[PDB]
Amino acid sequence: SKAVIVIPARYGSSRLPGKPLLDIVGKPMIQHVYERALQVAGVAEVWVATDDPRVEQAVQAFGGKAIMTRNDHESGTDRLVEVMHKVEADIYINLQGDEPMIRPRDVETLLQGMRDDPALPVATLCHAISAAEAAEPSTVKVVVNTRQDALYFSRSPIPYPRNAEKARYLKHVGIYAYRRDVLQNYSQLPESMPEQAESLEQLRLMNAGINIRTFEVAATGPGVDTPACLEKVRALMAQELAENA
Amino acid sequence: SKAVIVIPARYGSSRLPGKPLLDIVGKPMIQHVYERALQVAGVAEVWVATDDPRVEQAVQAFGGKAIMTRNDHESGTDRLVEVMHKVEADIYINLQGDEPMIRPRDVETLLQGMRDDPALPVATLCHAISAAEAAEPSTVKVVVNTRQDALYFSRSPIPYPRNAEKARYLKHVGIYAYRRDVLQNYSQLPESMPEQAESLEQLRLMNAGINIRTFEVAATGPGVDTPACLEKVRALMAQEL
Numbered sequence: 053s054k055a056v057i058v059i060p061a062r063y064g065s066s067r068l069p070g071k072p073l074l075d076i077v078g079k080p081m082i083q084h085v086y087e088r089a090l091q092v093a094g095v096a097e098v099w100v101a102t103d104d105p106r107v108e109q110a111v112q113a114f115g116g117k118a119i120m121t122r123n124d125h126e127s128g129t130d131r132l133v134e135v136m137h138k139v140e141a142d143i144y145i146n147l148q149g150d151e152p153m154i155r156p157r158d159v160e161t162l163l164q165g166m167r168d169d170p171a172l173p174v175a176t177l178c179h180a181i182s183a184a185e186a187a188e189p190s191t192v193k194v195v196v197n198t199r200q201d202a203l204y205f206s207r208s209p210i211p212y213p214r215n216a217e218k219a220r221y222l223k224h225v226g227i228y229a230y231r232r233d234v235l236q237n238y239s240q241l242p243e244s245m246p247e248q249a250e251s252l253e254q255l256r257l258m259n260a261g262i263n264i265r266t267f268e269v270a271a272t273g274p275g276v277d278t279p280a281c282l283e284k285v286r287a288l289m290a291q292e293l294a295e296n297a
Numbered sequence: 298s299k300a301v302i303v304i305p306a307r308y309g310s311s312r313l314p315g316k317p318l319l320d321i322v323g324k325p326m327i328q329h330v331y332e333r334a335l336q337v338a339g340v341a342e343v344w345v346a347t348d349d350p351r352v353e354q355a356v357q358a359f360g361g362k363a364i365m366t367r368n369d370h371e372s373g374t375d376r377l378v379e380v381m382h383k384v385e386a387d388i389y390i391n392l393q394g395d396e397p398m399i400r401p402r403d404v405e406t407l408l409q410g411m412r413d414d415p416a417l418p419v420a421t422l423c424h425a426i427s428a429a430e431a432a433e434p435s436t437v438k439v440v441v442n443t444r445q446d447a448l449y450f451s452r453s454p455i456p457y458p459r460n461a462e463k464a465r466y467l468k469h470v471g472i473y474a475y476r477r478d479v480l481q482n483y484s485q486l487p488e489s490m491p492e493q494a495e496s497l498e499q500l501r502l503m504n505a506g507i508n509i510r511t512f513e514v515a516a517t518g519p520g521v522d523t524p525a526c527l528e529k530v531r532a533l534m535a536q537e538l
């Protein structure tokens with residue numbers, strides 16, 4: 053069971069031009085993700101999927117494996133489908149190029165889940181959040197069953213707080229593990245109405261009846277999206293260097 | 298493939314004591330549901346499951362069939378489980394005793410769905426509602442996949458309208474069809490967190506991985522829970538004559 057980690061890293065960003073190349077304690081952000089991806093036990097290779105030559109250069113510059121992909125890709129999953137044809141593996145893990153604080157152990161939890169059940173097509177992560185955080189549309193919530201299979205994903209607060217004290221929210225962490233056959237059949241799947249409404253790509257899989265198991269982990273580090281969170285990451289990353297000295 | 302219709306009709310109600318016996322244009326509400334239930338092709342028997350003698354005798358008076366059930370049940374579903382032990386069938390349809398405007402056709406759509414797919418455990422109904430109606434916590438929304446299987450049931454507006462013009466809403470109509478084996482195992486299912494939070498009993502089935510297919514029908518008529526709706530239903534059923 054060969055498994056590879058793919059890291060989509062596109063330069064063009066609205067509120068942060070050249071986001072993967074931003075410096076964090078002396079290294080480009082993309083490098084931090086790559087370095088952490090390398091610490092994940094059970095992974096054969098680690099690739100960075102990109103559509104910008106500057107990003108490709110920066111990755112090769114530190115000895116990382118880069119693979120150019122089309123720029124006309126509407127979704128980040130289509131990008132993984134293109135990489136799938138060239139890079140062979142049984143399990144593909146999609147890490148986000150803008151989360152430098154990813155814990156290698158969480159990705160191993162994901163990978164182990166995929167290996168413990170050969171019939172599981174897709175797997176993802178989630179963690180507990182308060183009711184106040186769950187109210188944010190920018191935050192994606194998820195509800196699971198006893199087998200931890202996802203029932204639905206939404207920007208709306210679910211479950212609804214009818215009996216407020218009984219509600220427990222789970223924030224969806226955008227890291228996925230896909231079986232090879234799911235990616236082979238992906239481009240044939242049509243866009244669902246909930247997907248287009250919520251603007252959540254993962255609902256395309258649920259429309260087709262593809263099961264997505266969601267594993268719970270502790271609260272994840274703050275992902276870099278705003279310069280306010282960027283400084284917190286820089287200081288939180290630097291605080292980590294001096295603690296492990 | 299034997300199918301029977303069960304109509305839960307408890308005497309009590311916080312806003313309308315003795316609700317099933319309330320007169321709607323000449324007949325008690327329960328009689329309207331029972332008569333319409335008898336018009337559903339494919340059903341072998343129709344029973345009113347009640348907890349009060351005054352309701353039982355009222356049903357027997359007009360010719361219907363009634364069965365006494367315990368008074369400590371908190372849900373119409375639990376009451377149905379008690380009936381399943383006395384009345385044998387392969388498929389049980391649970392109609393609400395306070396919806397006298399039920400269309401016999403919609404129940405047949407439900408029954409046909411169950412018969413076309415022997416592997417389907419539970420089936421229910423739904424209809425389209427505007428985005429405005431979807432915002433109400435009292436209106437239970439549902440989202441389905443291509444095979445029309447329910448993804449989730451919620452009082453929250455789902456799907457979330459990030460792209461408003463793309464969102465389409467579905468209101469859940471509380472009529473169910475259960476395969477016998479589902480009822481035999483019901484008492485063993487544990488209450489779920491989403492069930493307790495949303496206060497929606499059907500989420501107990503989804504928590505267990507039991508598939509619920511939702512068939513779409515046209516907008517249904519109002520039920521009788523408040524004395525405001527009772528006057529509305531009397532008005533609607535008077536002009537329907």
Ligand SMILES: CC(=O)N[C@H]1[C@H]([C@H](O)[C@H](O)CO)O[C@](OP(=O)(O)OC[C@H]2O[C@@H](n3ccc(N)nc3=O)[C@H](O)[C@@H]2O)(C(=O)O)C[C@@H]1O
Pocket residue numbers: 304305306307308370371372373376392393394395396470471472518519520521522
């Ligand atoms: C399908 C549905 O929506 N049912 C709801 C009904 C009515 O159909 C609606 O007004 C239509 O929009 O109204 C409510 O009825 P009840 O609270 O009485 O409960 C449903 C049903 O189950 C029986 N029952 C209830 C409680 C207990 N402990 N045991 C029972 O056996 C009742 O007799 C009734 O027939 C309402 O608003 O009050 C809610 C229903 O979900």
